[PDB]
Design a protein around this ligand. Structure first.
Ligand SMILES: *[C@@H]1O[C@H](CO)[C@@H](O[C@@H]2O[C@H](CO)[C@@H](O)[C@H](O)[C@H]2NC(C)=O)[C@H](O)[C@H]1NC(C)=O
Ligand SMILES: *[C@@H]1O[C@H](CO)[C@@H](O[C@@H]2O[C@H](CO)[C@@H](O)[C@H](O)[C@H]2NC(C)=O)[C@H](O)[C@H]1NC(C)=O
Ligand SMILES: *[C@@H]1O[C@H](CO)[C@@H](O[C@@H]2O[C@H](CO)[C@@H](O)[C@H](O)[C@H]2NC(C)=O)[C@H](O)[C@H]1NC(C)=O
Ligand SMILES: *[C@@H]1O[C@H](CO)[C@@H](O)[C@H](O)[C@H]1NC(C)=O
Ligand SMILES: *[C@@H]1O[C@H](CO)[C@@H](O)[C@H](O)[C@H]1NC(C)=O
Ligand SMILES: *[C@@H]1O[C@H](CO)[C@@H](O)[C@H](O)[C@H]1NC(C)=O
Ligand SMILES: *[C@@H]1O[C@H](CO)[C@@H](O)[C@H](O)[C@H]1NC(C)=O
Ligand SMILES: *[C@@H]1O[C@H](CO)[C@@H](O)[C@H](O)[C@H]1NC(C)=O
Ligand SMILES: *[C@@H]1O[C@H](CO)[C@@H](O)[C@H](O)[C@H]1NC(C)=O
Ligand SMILES: *[C@@H]1O[C@H](CO)[C@@H](O)[C@H](O)[C@H]1NC(C)=O
Lengths: 248, 245, 196, 50
């Protein structure tokens, strides 16, 4: 629970949002996991990045073996027949032809395999980066390890690969309010310490930039500098301070 | 080729001109002393557009980078890719399933249609210098992401491949030096690289942490993901029956 | 250039579509800050977005709301400078032109490789086929064929390697667009010398 | 052509390799550029803080 709370804190949401929403988040989590199970069990062809590797490697090997059928412009393909039904003089020539041709084919296959393995090594390097940075920790670079803000991930094995279950946090149900950079109070310009200023039309509050949860504008959650002159777009309002009335 | 009349004027001692890579581009006819360009007439690739065998059987054909002034044949259209035969141009646009070229794509309503692709749901964001949107709800979602890490560590030996246990073939082969040494070394090298790939991507931890049997993870189900000693867990099995090795 | 067999296929996303993409991305990152990359777009006044990115790089946003005019003027004078610094100077778009000419040289050499005899008695196939009997012409044909095929195969391997390298650079471009446009990466010197 | 036909499947292999790189360039461009689900359009007014 507190692991998730820290991660929520890391993405930019005060950890409190987790605790009163813990059951809801758990339910969404398990529903989403079941949905992933359904999608992988029923709908195939989402795993193409391994099927292509296996199929293409197999096809390359298949054509390599098939190459032995071709006569490469020699008298015949099967070696023993020509080596029996030809004099050794002509046999050397025909063998030379077949050797150069087959060796050329084999060397071409080897070069193709080298390039393919270089591509696979680039993919495996990226996989190692993803595993180290989005499993063994939380990474805050956008659209690396999810779609939205990143919460965690779990590795999962595969036949010749790896599949990541990326648990990501996606905000929704936007509501728009009227904002402004500062407030003016006694000629003194107040900016938010963390979060944005909001107004639902007539009253102003301070929220966090990724979850609506208004709080009354207190002097503790706003650092003040400058004055009521130069900030382009200030709005007058009040700034409650708990220090003053409590003495009375 | 197709013969056209040349602007280029030969000198009185030349017979035929070649352009580059030794192809006769212009020729002077012998009976009139005129000069004719020889250009290759239209040719090019042909591709088919199919919605898949299982869906239906009607298909389209695309002749690559050719006019349709030269040649089943229901509707023709000239696109920047070439000639499209068998598909009717439609004005409205969607997200397209079959790439063609220059943005054109291609089954819907028991017919094959061609149409410029639509980039996305064209909607605008409203802006004003004092309005801000803020989310109130949130959904956590899980996405899979699949990467390859290894191929089959294969190996082939020349001496057994090009010859196949033929002594005299080997005695003639040995004249060619050490191509086999190079090929065996290259395949062994990529095999070593392949084992290193897995050994690097997975062995990131030098303990073996085993979860305690109690599963009370803040109310989070993990029973579908964590390993079950019944079988390697459930999910990896599900993927493990999705390949054709 | 293409004369026989060689050809170029037009790219799917034609130029106008690409320009429309980069207009959409530019507008989204002007108005909606980051959130259009993660979730649905959440419009935000641009000054507050700039202040919030300052706060990201380790500076309290007060400095901006007090110095918005200076920031705007520096940005404008910088855009003006870069457009002309690209306008005048030649070889300022090199790292695209170089790959273009390198591919063109490969193709041109591939074409020019036809003229070579490769030990045959001619180069144009119709003439060697038009003044020799089959049993004698077949060996010349075979020499010329193996020569052309070896040339073409060398070209194909060259193109494979070049395409692998360009694919590496394109994956780099995808990564750079993801964490340096949609968001605000703090990897130093990864996008722009200095704070980003 | 009949003589080349005796050279196995070299020709088809090379055509396939070039087809592969050609269809790969498409994916490169789409992956770099198609990272937006929608098409955002700029507002008419242009008063982005100056
Ligand atoms: C914005 O939300 C506040 C939430 O308190 C609304 O405040 C209402 O009116 C006064 C404000 O001092 C409170 O004493 C009331 O209790 C609030 N109403 C309720 C039902 O609790 C405020 O009205 C909202 N803005 C607008 C324009 O309606
Ligand atoms: C936030 O979104 C969740 C997800 O839909 C909402 O939870 C649903 O609420 C409706 C009605 O309130 C119920 O019928 C559903 O069963 C709820 N879903 C789940 C998974 O519990 C929630 O109401 C939204 N708002 C808040 C404030 O949480
Ligand atoms: C920070 O450096 C900038 C450099 O552009 C200063 O801005 C300009 O300074 C020159 C100096 O004479 C003035 O003529 C310009 O009018 C200034 N530009 C603007 C838009 O006002 C800026 O003054 C420097 N900051 C401080 C605090 O000295
Ligand atoms: C805030 O109040 C002062 C009081 O004199 C006034 O001068 C100023 O215009 C007010 N600002 C706004 C934005 O209403
Ligand atoms: C060539 O032959 C044609 C027909 O026999 C004749 O009309 C012409 O005068 C001859 N000479 C030239 C230079 O065309
Ligand atoms: C195709 O033929 C038409 C016939 O009028 C011509 O106008 C058009 O230019 C031709 N297109 C090309 C690409 O040659
Ligand atoms: C599509 O565009 C053509 C082009 O003129 C027009 O004739 C037709 O009415 C449009 N609408 C259709 C085909 O539904
Ligand atoms: C507020 O949001 C609604 C829908 O979310 C939108 O239609 C409206 O335009 C937004 N407000 C402004 C001022 O644009
Ligand atoms: C916001 O834009 C409107 C024009 O639609 C303009 O009249 C107004 O002055 C702007 N807001 C500020 C604070 O300048
Ligand atoms: C998790 O889901 C499984 C079904 O896949 C269920 O049997 C199990 O009871 C669930 N765990 C909890 C704690 O509800």
């Amino acid at each position: 629970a507190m692991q998730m709370a820290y991660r929520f804190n890391g993405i930019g949401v005060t950890q409190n949002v987790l605790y009163e929403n813990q059951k809801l988040i758990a339910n969404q989590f398990n529903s989403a996991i079941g949905k992933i199970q359904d999608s992988l069990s029923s709908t195939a062809s989402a795993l193409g990045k391994l099927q292509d590797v296996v199929n293409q490697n197999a096809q390359a090997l298949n054509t390599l073996v098939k190459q032995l059928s071709s006569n490469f412009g020699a008298i015949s393909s099967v070696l023993n027949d020509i080596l029996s039904r030809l004099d050794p003089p002509e046999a050397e020539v025909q063998i030379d032809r077949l050797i150069t041709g087959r060796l050329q084919s084999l060397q071409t296959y080897v070069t193709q395999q080298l390039i393919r393995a270089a591509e696979i090594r680039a993919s495996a390097n990226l996989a190692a980066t993803k595993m180290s940075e989005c499993v063994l920790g939380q990474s805050k670079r956008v659209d690396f390890c999810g779609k939205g803000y990143h919460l965690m991930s779990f590795p999962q094995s595969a036949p010749h690969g790896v599949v990541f279950l990326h648990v990501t946090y996606v905000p929704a149900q936007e509501k728009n309010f009227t904002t402004a950079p500062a407030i003016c109070h006694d000629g003194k310009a107040h900016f938010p310490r963390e979060g944005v200023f909001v107004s639902n039309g007539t009253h102003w509050f301070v929220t966090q930039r990724n979850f609506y949860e208004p709080q009354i504008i207190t002097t503790d959650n706003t650092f003040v500098s400058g004055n009521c002159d130069v900030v382009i777009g200030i709005v007058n309002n009040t700034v409650y301070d708990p220090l003053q009335p409590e003495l009375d | 080729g197709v013969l056209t009349e040349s602007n280029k004027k030969f000198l009185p001692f030349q017979q035929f001109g070649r352009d580059i890579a030794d192809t006769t581009d212009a020729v002077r006819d012998p009976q009139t002393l005129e000069i004719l360009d020889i250009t290759p007439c239209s040719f090019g690739g042909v591709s088919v557009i199919t919605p898949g065998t299982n869906t239906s059987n009607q298909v389209a054909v695309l002749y690559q980078d050719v006019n349709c002034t030269e040649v089943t044949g229901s509707n023709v259209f000239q696109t920047r890719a070439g000639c499209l035969i068998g598909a009717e141009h439609v004005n409205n646009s969607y997200e397209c399933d079959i790439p063609i070229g220059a943005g054109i794509c291609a089954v819907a309503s028991q017919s094959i249609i061609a149409y410029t692709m639509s980039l996305g749901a064209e909607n605008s964001v409203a802006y004003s210098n004092n309005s801000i949107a803020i989310p109130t709800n949130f959904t956590i979602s899980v996405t899979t992401e699949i990467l390859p890490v290894s191929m089959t560590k294969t190996s082939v030996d020349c001496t057994m491949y090009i010859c196949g246990d033929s002594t005299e073939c080997s005695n003639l082969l040995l004249q060619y030096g050490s191509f086999c040494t190079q090929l065996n070394r290259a395949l062994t090298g990529i095999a070593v690289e392949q084992d290193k790939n897995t050994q690097e991507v997975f062995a990131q931890v030098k303990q073996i942490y085993k979860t305690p049997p109690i599963k009370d993870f803040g109310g989070f189900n993990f029973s579908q993901i964590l390993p079950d000693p019944s079988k390697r867990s459930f999910i990896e099995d599900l993927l493990f029956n999705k390949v054709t090795l | 250039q293409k004369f026989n067999g060689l050809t170029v296929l037009p790219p799917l996303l034609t130029d106008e579509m690409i320009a429309q993409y980069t207009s959409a991305l530019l507008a989204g990152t002007i108005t909606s800050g980051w959130t259009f990359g993660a979730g649905a777009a959440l419009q935000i006044p641009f000054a507050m977005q700039m202040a919030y990115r300052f706060n990201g790089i380790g500076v309290t946003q007060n400095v901006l709301y007090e110095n918005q005019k200076l920031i705007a003027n520096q940005f404008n004078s910088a855009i003006g400078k870069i457009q002309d610094s690209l306008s005048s100077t030649a070889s300022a778009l090199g790292k695209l032109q170089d790959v273009v000419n390198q591919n063109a040289q490969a193709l041109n050499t591939l074409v020019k490789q036809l003229s070579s005899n490769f030990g045959a008695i001619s180069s144009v196939l119709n003439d060697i086929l038009s003044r020799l009997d089959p049993p004698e012409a077949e060996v010349q044909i075979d020499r010329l064929i193996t020569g052309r095929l070896q040339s073409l195969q060398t070209y194909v391997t060259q193109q494979l390697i070049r395409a692998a390298e360009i694919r590496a650079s394109a994956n780099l471009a995808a990564t750079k667009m993801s964490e340096c446009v949609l968001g605000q990466s703090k990897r130093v010197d990864f996008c722009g010398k200095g704070y980003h």
